[PDB]
Amino acid sequence: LAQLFLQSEAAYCCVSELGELGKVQFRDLNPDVNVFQRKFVNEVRRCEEMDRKLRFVEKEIRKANIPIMDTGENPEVPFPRDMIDLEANFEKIENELKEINTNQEALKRNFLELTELKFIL
Amino acid sequence: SQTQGIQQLLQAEKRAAEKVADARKRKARRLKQAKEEAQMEVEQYRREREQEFQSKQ
Amino acid sequence: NIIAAKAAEVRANKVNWQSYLQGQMISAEDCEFIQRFEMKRSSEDKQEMLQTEGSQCAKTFINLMTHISKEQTVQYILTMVDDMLQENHQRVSIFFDYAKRSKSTAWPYFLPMLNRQDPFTVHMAARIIAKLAAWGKELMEGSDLNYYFNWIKTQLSSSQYVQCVAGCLQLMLRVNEYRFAWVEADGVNCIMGVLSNKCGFQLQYQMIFSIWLLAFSPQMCEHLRRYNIIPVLSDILQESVKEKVTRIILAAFRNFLEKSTERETRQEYALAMIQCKVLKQLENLEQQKYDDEDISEDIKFLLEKLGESVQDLSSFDEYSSELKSGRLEWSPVHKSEKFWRENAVRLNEKNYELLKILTKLLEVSDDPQVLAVAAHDVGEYVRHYPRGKRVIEQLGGKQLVMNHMHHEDQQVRYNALLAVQKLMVHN
Amino acid sequence: ALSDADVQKQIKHMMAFIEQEANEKAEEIDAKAEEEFNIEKGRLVQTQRLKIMEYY
Amino acid sequence: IRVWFIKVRKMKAIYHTLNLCNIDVTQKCLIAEVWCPVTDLDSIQFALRRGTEHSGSTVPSILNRMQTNQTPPTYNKTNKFTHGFQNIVDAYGIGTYRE
């Protein structure tokens, strides 16, 4: 009914606002076009990477047996483009955690052989 | 409404095209224009130094 | 924007020049000549203004602002005639109405003008003074128009008028001579001061485009390179995604850094990379493809050029120089994996003096950051070369490093722990 | 109508864009070609400079 | 991480909705069909006004209302109280618009 016309960035902000509104719905006018040709697949695969790393850190938390709460901070909805850099920082944190885990198991192997040596003498 | 969606495109594309074409054409003429200007200036310099030549002769 | 709106409502309005044909108040002879050169739609009326020689075509309307006391009528007449002269697509293009014998007053005409900016007198003067961009002339009184506070006061401060005047100033800067003159001026300081301060987007685009115009000479670049505003501009780039300032900003980087007066001036590449992480921002721009082929090639040449630049910030000998200078700061050298794996045997420099500098820095370095860099470098030298590990063990650095595993700063705990984690291979 | 006026002010935004890339791209290409032709000016004057120096 | 997760998911959903669009050949501006009950279009326009308000480009935010040969949707929201009954009848099937 309504060919809602919006500038690009204003349309992104309006998408955020309208999803907060929770009353409207959309219709795809280019069904025979995928994200590949829409040039939007790149940020989509970025989001996929962030989701994968979120699941990653979540599962090493689960093996760490930390009782997550996740009770507050619902309506924040941030939208700065530097979120890619923020999740780059998150990637750095989980990266150093990964190397820490691998180093730690290597250290355990070393200490086990070393404990044997201590027992020999 | 729907009419504007093609008219504004026509405006934009035609004007970008003519700007690019004007740039290229002015370059093409300007090269020969500059060769002519350089020849002119150099001939004045030659005439000046020829006046000097006859003076010192 | 109100300038053009006021011009439009003027165009709607009417002034009966025939009733003012008795122009004792208004320049009677030019009022008679209004019959000619009024319909500019046809070029034959351009030939008509050519016939009237300029001296009989609005040269009596020169200094009409003082000749008319009523403000509204002179607003109207000034705006019509100046709109005609402002259009100037192919109407004149030869500064025809300049009165060669009265040429001494052609530029000093703006002295009696540049007053009553509310009736847009200066806002018509802004494009009248375009006898420089596309006309082969030079203003003598560059001080009374540019240094003068016709727009300097409004540069730091209505706002739409400042934007339109900034566009006229872009037109002024088209000439390289007066652009150079303003490079010597401190108005550039005002421009970058307002650039630093948050203001309207349109004005930000105009000022950064003026800065882009600055980058078209190598000697102007030489003078202006000593003002470190490139990191600020990358900051503005990454805090605002609008695709137009980004384009001209990247073009400004292009010309500014590619003028390349010398190697020391290409150190600006290094300064820009180190003082702002433009690499990842440019990579993000690369990821999202544009149809703008121009900015595509722009990102291409910038990425490759900064690539070989960082290759030149990736070398053993510069590291030796920096370490011998008692100076260490996180740089591409400190993350230069080729210097780390390929040139680790070079870290065995004569009498292990490099390792000795590091080893003595393990106790005399009281700066946590330099000490962190040293700890990381030692960590690399141990993860690559195990007999170099045993060399360090002989040097006794492990006792000092143990202390860093428990040296206050939490960045010191981390780097000491990581270096020793490397240290525990074969152990 | 209100919708008609919104259409007209969007059309004003469209025309503002048109004039935006107009002036901006115009001066972009103009300056680039001007200084490129100044380099060409220098080149032609260089060959002329060689001619004058050999002659004199 | 507990809130980083929801933030990233929100961004993913946003770009999913942007998938549902029309890259306008006319302009860098987008266009898209939006279906919603007509009774409360004014609050929708107020949401549009807020969205354009956050951006400084003073976006008009046209709404091109117009009839079309499509199938209207019907979901008439009743309340919490009768959610089970409407759930039952909807489970059996869905009827035409304004029925």
From Swiss-Prot, chain A:
Predominantly expressed in neurons in the cortex and in the dentate gyrus, CA1 and CA3 regions of the hippocampus (at protein level). Expressed at lower levels in astrocytes, oligodendrocytes and microglia (at protein level). In the cerebellum, present in Purkinje and granule cells (at protein level). It is found in: Cytoplasmic vesicle, Clathrin-coated vesicle membrane; Cytoplasmic vesicle, Secretory vesicle, Synaptic vesicle membrane; Melanosome. Disruption phenotype: Embryonic lethal. Knockout embryos die at 5 to 6 dpc, before gastrulation. V-ATPase is a heteromultimeric enzyme made up of two complexes: the ATP-hydrolytic V1 complex and the proton translocation V0 complex. The V1 complex consists of three catalytic AB heterodimers that form a heterohexamer, three peripheral stalks each consisting of EG heterodimers, one central rotor including subunits D and F, and the regulatory subunits C and H. The proton translocation complex V0 consists of the proton transport subunit a, a ring of proteolipid subunits c9c'', rotary subunit d, subunits e and f, and the accessory subunits ATP6AP1/Ac45 and ATP6AP2/PRR. Interacts with SPAAR. Belongs to the V-ATPase 116 kDa subunit family. This is V-type proton ATPase 116 kDa subunit a 1. It comes from Mus musculus.
From Swiss-Prot, chain B:
It comes from the Eukaryota. Residues 33-53 have a biased composition (Basic and acidic residues). Transmembrane segments: none annotated. It is found in: Melanosome; Cytoplasmic vesicle, Clathrin-coated vesicle membrane. Belongs to the V-ATPase G subunit family. V-ATPase is a heteromultimeric enzyme made up of two complexes: the ATP-hydrolytic V1 complex and the proton translocation V0 complex. The V1 complex consists of three catalytic AB heterodimers that form a heterohexamer, three peripheral stalks each consisting of EG heterodimers, one central rotor including subunits D and F, and the regulatory subunits C and H. The proton translocation complex V0 consists of the proton transport subunit a, a ring of proteolipid subunits c9c'', rotary subunit d, subunits e and f, and the accessory subunits ATP6AP1/Ac45 and ATP6AP2/PRR. Subunit of the V1 complex of vacuolar(H+)-ATPase (V-ATPase), a multisubunit enzyme composed of a peripheral complex (V1) that hydrolyzes ATP and a membrane integral complex (V0) that translocates protons. V-ATPase is responsible for acidifying and maintaining the pH of intracellular compartments and in some cell types, is targeted to the plasma membrane, where it is responsible for acidifying the extracellular environment. This is V-type proton ATPase subunit G 2. It comes from Mus musculus. The lineage of its organism: Eukaryota, Metazoa, Chordata, Craniata, Vertebrata. The chain holds residues 3 to 59 of 118 of the full protein.
Swiss-Prot record, chain D:
The modification Phosphotyrosine is found at Y55. The modification N-acetylalanine is found at A1. It comes from the Eukaryota. It is found in: Apical cell membrane; Cytoplasmic vesicle, Secretory vesicle, Synaptic vesicle membrane; Cytoplasmic vesicle, Clathrin-coated vesicle membrane. Expressed within the midpiece of sperm tail (at protein level). Kidney; localizes to early distal nephron, encompassing thick ascending limbs and distal convoluted tubules (at protein level). V-ATPase is a heteromultimeric enzyme made up of two complexes: the ATP-hydrolytic V1 complex and the proton translocation V0 complex. The V1 complex consists of three catalytic AB heterodimers that form a heterohexamer, three peripheral stalks each consisting of EG heterodimers, one central rotor including subunits D and F, and the regulatory subunits C and H. The proton translocation complex V0 consists of the proton transport subunit a, a ring of proteolipid subunits c9c'', rotary subunit d, subunits e and f, and the accessory subunits ATP6AP1/Ac45 and ATP6AP2/PRR. Belongs to the V-ATPase E subunit family. This is V-type proton ATPase subunit E 1. The chain holds residues 2 to 57 of 226 of the full protein.
Curated annotation (Swiss-Prot), chain E:
Disruption phenotype: Embryonic lethal. Knockout embryos die at 5 to 6 dpc, before gastrulation. Predominantly expressed in neurons in the cortex and in the dentate gyrus, CA1 and CA3 regions of the hippocampus (at protein level). Expressed at lower levels in astrocytes, oligodendrocytes and microglia (at protein level). In the cerebellum, present in Purkinje and granule cells (at protein level). The modification Phosphotyrosine is found at Y75. It comes from the Eukaryota. The modification Phosphothreonine is found at T71. It is found in: Cytoplasmic vesicle, Clathrin-coated vesicle membrane; Cytoplasmic vesicle, Secretory vesicle, Synaptic vesicle membrane; Melanosome. V-ATPase is a heteromultimeric enzyme made up of two complexes: the ATP-hydrolytic V1 complex and the proton translocation V0 complex. The V1 complex consists of three catalytic AB heterodimers that form a heterohexamer, three peripheral stalks each consisting of EG heterodimers, one central rotor including subunits D and F, and the regulatory subunits C and H. The proton translocation complex V0 consists of the proton transport subunit a, a ring of proteolipid subunits c9c'', rotary subunit d, subunits e and f, and the accessory subunits ATP6AP1/Ac45 and ATP6AP2/PRR. Interacts with SPAAR. Belongs to the V-ATPase 116 kDa subunit family. This is V-type proton ATPase 116 kDa subunit a 1. The chain holds residues 297 to 395 of 839 of the full protein.
